[PDB]
Design a protein around this motif. Sequence first.
Motif, PDB file in Angstrom:
ATOM      1  N   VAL A  90       0.822  -1.197   0.000  1.00 40.87           N
ATOM      2  CA  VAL A  90       0.000   0.000   0.000  1.00 40.87           C
ATOM      3  C   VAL A  90       0.858   1.250   0.000  1.00 40.87           C
ATOM      4  N   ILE A  91       1.901   1.328   0.791  1.00 42.76           N
ATOM      5  CA  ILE A  91       2.782   2.467   0.791  1.00 42.76           C
ATOM      6  C   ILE A  91       3.428   2.697  -0.571  1.00 42.76           C
ATOM      7  N   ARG A  92       3.842   1.627  -1.211  1.00 40.14           N
ATOM      8  CA  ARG A  92       4.478   1.770  -2.495  1.00 40.14           C
ATOM      9  C   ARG A  92       3.464   2.231  -3.533  1.00 40.14           C
ATOM     10  N   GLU A  93       2.212   1.820  -3.422  1.00 42.94           N
ATOM     11  CA  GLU A  93       1.217   2.259  -4.404  1.00 42.94           C
ATOM     12  C   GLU A  93       0.950   3.746  -4.337  1.00 42.94           C
ATOM     13  N   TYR A  94       0.865   4.303  -3.138  1.00 43.94           N
ATOM     14  CA  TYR A  94       0.479   5.691  -2.931  1.00 43.94           C
ATOM     15  C   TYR A  94       1.600   6.677  -2.752  1.00 43.94           C
ATOM     16  N   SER A  95       2.803   6.214  -2.434  1.00 46.06           N
ATOM     17  CA  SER A  95       3.959   7.086  -2.142  1.00 46.06           C
ATOM     18  C   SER A  95       3.569   8.348  -1.376  1.00 46.06           C
ATOM     19  N   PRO A  96       2.990   8.173  -0.179  1.00 48.09           N
ATOM     20  CA  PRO A  96       2.499   9.323   0.544  1.00 48.09           C
ATOM     21  C   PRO A  96       3.625  10.244   0.978  1.00 48.09           C
ATOM     22  N   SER A  97       3.364  11.535   0.931  1.00 47.85           N
ATOM     23  CA  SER A  97       4.309  12.572   1.390  1.00 47.85           C
ATOM     24  C   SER A  97       4.222  12.843   2.878  1.00 47.85           C
ATOM     25  N   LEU A  98       3.041  12.628   3.457  1.00 48.94           N
ATOM     26  CA  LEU A  98       2.757  12.940   4.874  1.00 48.94           C
ATOM     27  C   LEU A  98       1.831  11.868   5.396  1.00 48.94           C
ATOM     28  N   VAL A  99       2.363  11.037   6.295  1.00 46.94           N
ATOM     29  CA  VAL A  99       1.631   9.970   6.949  1.00 46.94           C
ATOM     30  C   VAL A  99       1.465  10.289   8.420  1.00 46.94           C
ATOM     31  N   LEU A 100       0.273  10.009   8.961  1.00 47.16           N
ATOM     32  CA  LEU A 100       0.039  10.020  10.418  1.00 47.16           C
ATOM     33  C   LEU A 100      -0.172   8.586  10.862  1.00 47.16           C
ATOM     34  N   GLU A 101       0.526   8.162  11.903  1.00 45.59           N
ATOM     35  CA  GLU A 101       0.318   6.878  12.562  1.00 45.59           C
ATOM     36  C   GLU A 101      -0.250   7.124  13.943  1.00 45.59           C
ATOM     37  N   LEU A 102      -1.312   6.398  14.258  1.00 47.75           N
ATOM     38  CA  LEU A 102      -1.892   6.422  15.631  1.00 47.75           C
ATOM     39  C   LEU A 102      -1.498   5.131  16.285  1.00 47.75           C
ATOM     40  N   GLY A 103      -0.539   5.196  17.205  1.00 49.25           N
ATOM     41  CA  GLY A 103      -0.129   3.988  17.945  1.00 49.25           C
ATOM     42  C   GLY A 103       1.223   3.364  17.612  1.00 49.25           C
TER      43      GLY A 103
END
Length: 213
Positions: free
Chosen positions: A51-64
Motif C-alpha cells: 500500500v505504501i508503495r502504491e500511494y507514495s504518501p508525502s505525509l503519513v500520520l500513525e496512531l499507535g
Amino acid sequence: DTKEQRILRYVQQNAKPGDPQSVLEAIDTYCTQKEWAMNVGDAKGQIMDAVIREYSPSLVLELGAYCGYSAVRMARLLQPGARLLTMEINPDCAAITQQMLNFAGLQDKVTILNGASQDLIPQLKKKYDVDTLDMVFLDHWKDRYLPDTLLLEKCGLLRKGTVLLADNVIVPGTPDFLAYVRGSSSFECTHYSSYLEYMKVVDGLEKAIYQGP
Ligand SMILES: O=C(NCCCCc1cc2cnccc2s1)c1cc(-c2ccc(F)cc2)cc(O)c1O
Ligand SMILES: [Cl-]
Ligand SMILES: [Cl-]
Ligand SMILES: [Mg+2]
C-alpha cells in the motif's frame, strides 16, 4: 526491565545500525522465538508495504507507535523529504520508538509524539504545520478508530484520496469502524485478509479511501 526494552536491546545487539530491514527482521525474530508482542508483524507488514508503495504518501500520520516497528516499516519506504508523524500515549514506548528509529537511521523522517490522539489531532494543523494528510495508519485503541476518523474529518485533515489503513479490524476487532466506513459514501473500502502478528489466527487490514463529504 520490560518486554519492550528487551525488544529494543535485541535489535541493538542483532541488527545493523542504519539498516531498517535488519531492524524489522530482528524484531520479528525476537517476537517469534522469545516473547510475542503487538507489532504489526511481517504478514500484515508486507500488505502495508504494498500500500505504501502504491500511494507514495508525502505525509503519513500513525496512531499507535508501540516500539516503532510499523514506523520503521513505513518510513523506510518514504521518498526523500516525505514525513511520518506517529502518536504514542505510553511515554516508555514513545522513548523506545524514538530509540528504534535512531538505531534504524530514520529519525530525520519521523516525529514521535507523546500524548493521546484526541488531544493531539486538534493540534496538528497549527503545531505540526499540517495541511492535509496523505495517509493514516490506525493501530491504537480499537474503540478509537471510529471517533478519531470523525475527529480527523472535523479538523479538516482529510482530503479526497486520503488513505486510511487500519490494523486489527478482525482481532481484536473494530466493528463500529468497519460498519461505518463500509456503509459510508464518503469512503471506498477494501479488506486485506491476513494473520495476526506471529500467530496462526486470522486478522486483516482495512483500507478506506476518503472521498470528500
Ligand atoms: O491493543 C492493541 N493496540 C493498541 C495499543 C493502544 C495504545 C495506544 C493508545 C493511544 C492513544 N492515543 C495515541 C496513541 C496511542 S497508542 C493491539 C492488540 C493486539 C492483540 C492483543 C491481544 C491479543 F490476544 C490479540 C491481539 C494486537 C495488535 O496488533 C494491537 O495493535
Ligand atoms: Cl507496530
Ligand atoms: Cl507475522
Ligand atoms: Mg495492531
